[PDB]
Amino acid sequence: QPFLNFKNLREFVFKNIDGYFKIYSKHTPIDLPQGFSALEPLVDLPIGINITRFQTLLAAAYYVGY
């Protein structure tokens, strides 16, 4: 099932540990707003691939942090 003035903030955390890929997500109705949000686990995938680079597919703004 799909994950889905700017009224939508989508927060995603991507982690690769032990060949398992972790996505944590929370969607907040709205510079990033100053607030506290905890991201619930969404799915974990056994990709088992080395990831060194990432790119974003675009058909607004996005924020990337390490």
Partner 1 sequence: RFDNPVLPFNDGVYFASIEKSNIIRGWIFGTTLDSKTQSLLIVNNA
Partner 2 sequence: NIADYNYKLPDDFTGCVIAWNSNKLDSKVSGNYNYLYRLFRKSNLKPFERDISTEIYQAGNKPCNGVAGFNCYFPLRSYSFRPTYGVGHQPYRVVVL
Ligand X SMILES: CC(=O)N[C@@H]1[C@@H](O)[C@H](O)[C@@H](CO)O[C@H]1O
Interface residues with partner 2 (CB under 8 A) are 18-20, 46, 48-50
Site string for partner 1, 2-31 (x = CB under 8 A): xxxxxxxxxxxxxxx----x--------x-
For residue 11, the partner it binds in partner 2, ligand X, partner 1, none, with Cβ less than 5 to 8 A by kind, is partner 1
Cβ-proximal residues to 21 (8 Å cutoff; 6+ apart), any chain = 14, 15, 44, 45, 46, 47
Q: Are 27 and 8 in contact (CB under 8 A)?
A: yes
Q: Strand 8-17 to strand 40-45: parallel, antiparallel, or no bridges (unpaired)?
A: unpaired
Interacting residues toward partner 1 by CB under 8 A: 2-16, 21, 30, 32, 47, 49-66
